[PDB]
């Protein structure tokens, strides 16, 4: 089932069916070129474009450089047959990758069946094909066959990376805009790609790579295919509809050319730059064009130039345009079907949806302009796959989009010179005599300022409410399930035939569709300014590579006037520390302190509880970009609290919402029904008005405000990168200043330091993204929406007055219902429709914020060991290798629980990927796992340290070892300097939370501060590891008892995880509560609570008591008896007796399955073991007093007494509750105890039901089930 059903090579001999020389439309005479038919109506011509446009028969650069950010020229590209074969295979591979996805499958299918309309006949009763939509294919015998087609993929023109859709036009018809459609020629190259900067994904992928990221070529092809799909159905937006920009201010760009068609093609937030008025305009325009096509098909009487029947062509176009055919065969356009088709072609065929489907990193908007050009090679499967692209699965490239990172996947991307040279199109910004200091600012580094006329509206135009006035439906955001709805109802069966048409002329005559004449925007415009701009602050933080020591400086002045001075917004103490000359012996500590200070200042966040919509503030944004004005960062914080987000904007945007058009109501005399319908329609149209103004404000916000915030965010990323690079340059100068002897004695890897500063910047960018997003949303909510809400309330007042007059005018007609209609009007119009941001923007759903947090935790795991299906595997994207020993025991009930014995064959080995093995001096990392350590019984375990988890290589790495009441974490560098942290639990204790119980261990390692060990989510100990050098961990992680002298010793372990960052306390608590399996009850040791298993009982209010039965029968009772006693082995353990007292057995009553696992809210029976035989726990609910004394009864003697027990699991999940219920479903109360004289009897009490969960008063009815375990092993 491939889209290309044949293996095509460029040296394959011509056959005239799918491989042949062809001639397409041309201005004059054209040399035939070899082309390949890869699918129906889909041809590929591996040739440079010198024929489609006669003005571009030259592959040399144009007279003036194109006003594009990135351009590349190579007249020698795609000349050799090897290059052409590579091109053909790459295009084939990209088509296969697109067709593999659901959305791409639909897109290609729609392209194939969108045959250009046969509108060439001057006579309305005939159907004649248009020549320019066809080609001539030369046959082996020398004759040529004219064939109609839909799409041709050819190589680029002079500019290699300028990809676009071309089509040959008509004398009078605009085929791409009248619904007809024309054959589309896409200029494309699969051997090159763009390189862009991204910082938004650090929230979910904090391990994002540094430097540029490379666009997946499949996305660019899909973009051009969507252009082709718009053009083939004749619904392409007019290329003179351009989003105008203001180019007069110093901060504004010199000029930008983007089309409404391009904005529609992009989708996402870019498509929302168009208001709803113009969208409805476009929809109705193309609707009437489709109706034109329908009427043309109707008045048709014959076909010309082919052997195919007229009815067949009518059917083909019926399926292309989804026309409705009535009982007489006449065609018409259904509004519903046209809606589906137009929405699918315009709103679903978007680059954003293809980004969602391809699972690749890509720019969220067109304003994230490309920055570099990279040579690639996608044909080899080791470099690029149909299903994964550059992000090859089960490799380092699969995680964090590292396949697209030009620095990590460097063998796949070779940087090329950008022919758009540095500062080719720019503005000259000068600061007045602080003579003039002037900087060139690149055009695409300036601010996008949309013009006001782009946001046209008729909000001030009134409407006439009729009883027939149509109420509109919703506008569902394009979600993935709607795409699936169209996918499941899509028809992939019919494909139009490649019919036989009458032969055209030898040379097809035709020219491209005329493009509007675009003016080159002004360049080099000089501005004379009184204040330093944000561009000056960002420029002052740059420098040139060289030998000379660059020095940091807090004076923007001094930095701007010296190449060897770099401005920094850090503290002056940082400047003094970095610029000082440091000796060799003090070099490593110097670098560590510099890293610590860099991370401290970049991660600085000031929480505010004084303003509503903003919760955090990053202060250094002030001096980083001169946001606002004033001296300190305290000015920035205070002015942000006082004024609001408005200080972050470079231009205050006009949010002009006029007086809303009032409704005029038509009067229907002596007619009750139509009058009440008019009233209802007026109210509904008022609701629609509320939604319309909200949508207009959201569009203005997305175009005018959010773009400025995005540019500020990009510039913050750039400033952080500049600071990091400057610090690295100074440190490496200092290192290189040394004699090479000192350079041998100091093991310094600057790439390691570059990494460390990279993730510090990633954290800083997480904070900056959150803060700036909050600022943009706050400005929308507080500074723009209220103008609306005011205008809307005024409209409500006007509508209320007009209605009330309308109702009192038809008082005779609405006889009796005057009061009800009056109340309806007054009550509906006295309320406000609240503005909900989740309704108009896809980003701001709360569930997505929760998902972002959980993903951020997940995506930091470089190793995640879980038991899936029938094997223990690595669920991380790296997918390391797992070798399971022959004597590794998995728990049959919970196969995640792994038992390791003191045997050589009871071992688990993890072969790590070469890109995730630890070898650094600065990279923090963490580990977490659940371990169950049995009690120690022998004195041979005293002072016997044995490793269980091993990642040591030549005495360097990390290990987890065990000793008598000791969990030990050991770090050791390559210099054999080692540090150990310990958690100690004593065996001389009544009841222990750690002995033979599941323990959640977490070890975090900050290479600059400390190694911390946490138990059950609480910090336990820490040791300073800042004095450790370079650590080289092992290529494999070994789980096995190593050196354990206790022959019968074993451990239990589950849910092992290795993370690439230092977890904070909150994250560790989240992990502890997440991995608790909160839906399942647990026994005392932490395992799964099971049916038909005997459990001794513990009461959490009085742990020193055990359940005993005074007498069997209805006249007897059960009570808590103490003390438990003590079991001991001298100098080893002295613990309370746990196996004392009566036993409970949980019996299945209403279980809908057979697994013997007690889940939450399970209705069960409970048996009591007395003298090694089972009775039933029950009570008489009709006895006086809320406290119902429980008793152990003979099983055949229970009768109709209260016995049904509802179980509850409260957080491990050790805390267990038992709510008793009679046979009528009523509550008897939770099972705890109550004092009767001396004896505390077991009692069902409804007083517990009256207490809030987790309250201290609920600790009396909290229970702990204790089964006999080999880890405890006292005498039963």
């Amino acid at each position: 089932m491939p889209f290309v059903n044949k293996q095509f090579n460029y040296k394959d001999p011509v056959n005239g069916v799918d491989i042949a020389y062809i001639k397409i439309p041309n201005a004059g005479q054209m040399q035939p070129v070899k082309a390949f038919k890869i699918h129906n109506k889909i041809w590929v011509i591996p040739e440079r474009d010198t024929f489609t446009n006669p003005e571009e028969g030259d592959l040399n650069p144009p007279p003036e450089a194109k006003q594009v950010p990135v351009s590349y020229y190579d007249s020698t590209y795609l000349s050799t047959d090897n290059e052409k074969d590579n091109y053909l295979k790459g295009v084939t591979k990209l088509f296969e990758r697109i067709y593999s996805t659901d959305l791409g499958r639909m897109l290609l299918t729609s392209i194939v069946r969108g045959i250009p309309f046969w509108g060439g006949s001057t006579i309305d009763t005939e159907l004649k094909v248009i020549d320019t939509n066809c080609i001539n294919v030369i046959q082996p015998d020398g004759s040529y066959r004219s064939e109609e087609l839909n799409l041709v993929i050819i190589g680029p023109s002079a500019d290699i990376i300028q990809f676009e859709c071309k089509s040959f036009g008509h004398e009078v018809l605009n085929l791409t805009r009248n619904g007809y459609g024309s054959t589309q020629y896409i200029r494309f190259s699969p051997d090159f790609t763009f390189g862009f900067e991204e910082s938004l994904e650090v929230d979910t992928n904090p391990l994002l790579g540094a430097g540029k990221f490379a666009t997946d070529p499949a996305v660019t092809l899909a973009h051009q295919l969507i252009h082709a799909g718009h053009r083939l159905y004749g619904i392409a937006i007019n290329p003179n509809r351009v989003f105008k920009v203001n180019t007069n201010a110093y901060y504004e760009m010199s000029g930008l050319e983007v089309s409404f068609e391009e904005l529609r093609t992009f989708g996402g937030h870019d498509a929302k730059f168009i208001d709803s008025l113009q969208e409805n305009e476009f929809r109705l325009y193309y609707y009437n064009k489709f109706k034109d096509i329908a009427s043309t098909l109707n008045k048709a009487k014959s076909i010309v130039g082919t052997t195919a029947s007229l009815q067949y062509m009518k059917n083909v176009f019926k399926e292309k345009y989804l026309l409705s055919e009535d009982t007489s065969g006449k065609f018409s356009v259904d509004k519903l079907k046209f809606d589906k088709l137009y929405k699918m072609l315009t709103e679903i065929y978007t680059e954003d949806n293809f980004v969602k489907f391809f699972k690749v990193l890509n720019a969220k908007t067109f304003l994230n302009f490309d920055k570099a050009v990279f040579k690639i090679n996608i044909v080899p499967k080791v470099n690029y796959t149909i299903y994964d692209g550059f992000n090859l699965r089960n490799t380092n490239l699969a995680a964090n989009f590292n396949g697209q990172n030009t620095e990590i996947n460097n063998m796949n991307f070779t940087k090329l010179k950008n022919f758009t040279g540095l500062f080719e199109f720019y503005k000259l910004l000068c600061v007045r005599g602080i003579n003039d200091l002037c900087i060139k600012v690149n055009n695409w580094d300036l601010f996008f300022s949309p013009s006001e006329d782009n946001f046209t509206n008729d909000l001030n135009k009134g409407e006439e409410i009729t009883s027939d006035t149509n109420i509109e439906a919703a506008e569902e955001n394009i979600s993935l399930d709607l795409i699936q709805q169209y996918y499941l109802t899509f028809n992939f069966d019919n494909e139009p035939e490649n019919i036989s048409i009458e032969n055209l002329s030898s040379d097809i005559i035709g020219q491209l569709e005329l493009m509007p004449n675009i003016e080159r925007f002004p360049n080099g415009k000089k501005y004379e300014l009184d204040k330093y701009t944000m561009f000056h602050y960002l420029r002052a933080q740059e420098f040139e590579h060289g030998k000379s020591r660059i020095a940091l400086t807090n004076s923007v002045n001094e930095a701007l006037l010296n190449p060897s001075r770099v401005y920094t917004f850090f503290s002056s103490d940082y400047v003094k520390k970095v610029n000082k000359a440091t000796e060799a012996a003090m070099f490593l500590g110097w670098v560590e302190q510099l890293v610590y200070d860099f991370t401290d200042e970049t991660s600085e966040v000031s929480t505010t509880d004084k303003i509503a919509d903003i919760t955090i503030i990053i202060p250094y944004i002030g001096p980083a970009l001169n946001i606002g004005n004033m001296l300190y960062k305290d000015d920035f914080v205070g002015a942000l609290i006082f004024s609001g987000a408005v200080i972050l904007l470079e231009f205050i945007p006009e949010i002009a919402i006029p007086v809303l058009g009032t409704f005029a109501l038509v009067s229907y005399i002596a007619n009750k029904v139509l009058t009440v319908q008019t009233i209802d329609n007026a109210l509904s149209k008022r609701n629609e008005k509320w939604d319309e103004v909200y949508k207009y404000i959201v569009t203005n916000w997305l175009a005018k405000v959010n773009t400025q915030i995005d540019l500020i965010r990009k510039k913050m990323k750039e400033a952080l990168e500049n600071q990091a690079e400057a610090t690295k340059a100074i440190i490496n100068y200092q290192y290189n200043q040394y004699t090479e002897e000192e350079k041998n004695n100091i093991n310094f890897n600057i790439d390691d330091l570059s990494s460390k500063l990279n993730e510090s910047i990633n954290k800083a960018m997480i904070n900056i993204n959150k803060f700036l997003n909050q600022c943009s949303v706050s400005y929308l909510m507080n500074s723009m929406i209220p103008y609306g809400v005011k205008r809307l309330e005024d409209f409500d007042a006007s509508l209320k007055d007009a209605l009330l007059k309308y109702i009192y005018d038809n008082r005779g007609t609405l006889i009796g219902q005057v009061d009800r209609l009056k109340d309806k009007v007054n009550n509906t119009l006295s309320t406000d429709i609240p503005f909900q941001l989740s309704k108009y923007v896809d980003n701001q759903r709360l569930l997505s914020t929760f998902t972002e947090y959980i993903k951020n935790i997940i995506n930091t795991s470089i190793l995640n060991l879980r038991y899936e299906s029938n094997h223990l595997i690595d669920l991380s994207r790296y997918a390391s290798k797992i070798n399971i020993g022959s004597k590794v025991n998995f728990d049959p009930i919970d196969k995640n629980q792994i038992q390791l014995f003191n045997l050589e064959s009871s071992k688990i080995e993890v072969i790590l990927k070469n890109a995730i093995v630890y070898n650094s001096m600065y990279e923090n990392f963490s580990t977490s796992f659940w371990i169950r350590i049995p009690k120690y019984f022998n004195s041979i375990s005293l002072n016997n340290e044995y490793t269980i988890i091993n990642c040591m290589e030549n005495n360097s790495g990390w290990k987890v070892s065990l000793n008598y009441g000791e969990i030990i974490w050991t770090l050791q560098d390559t210099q054999e300097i080692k540090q150990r942290v310990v958690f100690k639990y004593s065996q001389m204790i009544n009841i222990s939370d750690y002995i033979n119980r599941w323990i959640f261990v977490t070890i975090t390692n900050n290479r600059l501060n400390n190694s911390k060990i946490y138990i059950n989510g609480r910090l336990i100990d820490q040791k300073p590891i800042s004095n450790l050098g370079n650590i080289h961990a092992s290529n494999n992680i070994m789980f096995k008892l190593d050196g354990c002298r206790d022959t019968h010793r074993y451990i239990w372990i589950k849910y092992f995880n290795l993370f690439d960052k230092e977890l904070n306390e909150k994250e560790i608590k989240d992990l502890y509560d997440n991995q608790s399996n909160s839906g399942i009850l647990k026994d005392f040791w932490g395992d799964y609570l099971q049916y038909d298993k005997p459990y001794y009982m513990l009461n959490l209010y009085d742990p020193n008591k055990y359940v005993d039965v005074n007498n069997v029968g209805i006249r007897g009772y059960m009570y808590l008896k103490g003390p438990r006693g003590s079991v001991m082995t001298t100098n080893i353990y002295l613990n309370s007796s746990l196996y004392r007292g009566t036993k409970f057995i949980i019996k299945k009553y209403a279980s809908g399955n057979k697994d013997n696992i007690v889940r939450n809210n399970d209705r069960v029976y409970i048996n009591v073991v007395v003298k090694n035989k089972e009775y039933r726990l029950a009570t008489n609910a009709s006895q006086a007093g809320v406290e119902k004394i429980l008793s152990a009864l003979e099983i055949p003697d229970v009768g109709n007494l209260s016995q049904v027990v509802v179980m509850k699991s409260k957080n491990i999940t050790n805390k267990c509750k038992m709510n008793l219920q009679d046979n009528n479903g009523n509550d008897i109360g939770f099972i705890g105890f109550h004092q009767f004289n001396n004896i505390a009897k077991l009692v069902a009490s409804n007083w517990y039901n009256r207490q809030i969960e987790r309250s201290s008063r609920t600790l009396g009815c909290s229970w702990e089930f204790i089964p006999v375990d080999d880890g405890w092993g006292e005498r039963p």
């Epitope: 003179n240 008025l277 305009e281 109705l284 325009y285 609707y287 009437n288 046209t456 008729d458 149509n470």
Partner: nanobody, 114 residues
Framework: QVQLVESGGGLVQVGGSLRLSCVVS????????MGWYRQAPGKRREMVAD???????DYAGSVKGRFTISRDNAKKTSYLQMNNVKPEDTGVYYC????????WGQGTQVTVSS
């Protein structure tokens, strides 16, 4: 119900000028595109010009540079100014409102005489 009424058609000499107008009743025609088509004797009714509510224009090949389409949303009227007319411009001109329906006018005859 929506109604389109055209006016201003007559016979015109080669190179002369003629102004066609069309008024709308029953709809505000704000945010709604408009167009002028012409039907030659024996040929299909063909697009001549289109104008959007924002004022953007889209012309055919044989008519560009000689005809100018304008509109007034306030007066709910579409205009087509025909300058430097040629014998191919003879036919019945129809106005169209690209709205919720196939809103057409009655049609007015333009004959270029020489």
């Amino acid at each position: 119900q929506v109604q389109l009424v055209e006016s201003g058609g007559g016979l015109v000499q080669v190179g002369g000028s003629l102004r066609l107008s069309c008024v709308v009743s029953g709809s505000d025609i704000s945010g709604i595109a408009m167009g002028w088509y012409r039907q030659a004797p024996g040929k299909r009714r063909e697009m001549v010009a289109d104008i959007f509510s924002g004022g953007s224009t889209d012309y055919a090949g044989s008519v560009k540079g000689r005809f100018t389409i304008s509109r007034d949303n306030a007066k709910k009227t579409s205009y087509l100014q025909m300058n430097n007319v040629k014998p191919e411009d003879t036919g019945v001109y129809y106005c169209r409102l690209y709205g919720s329906g196939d809103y057409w006018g009655q049609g007015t005859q333009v004959t270029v005489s020489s």
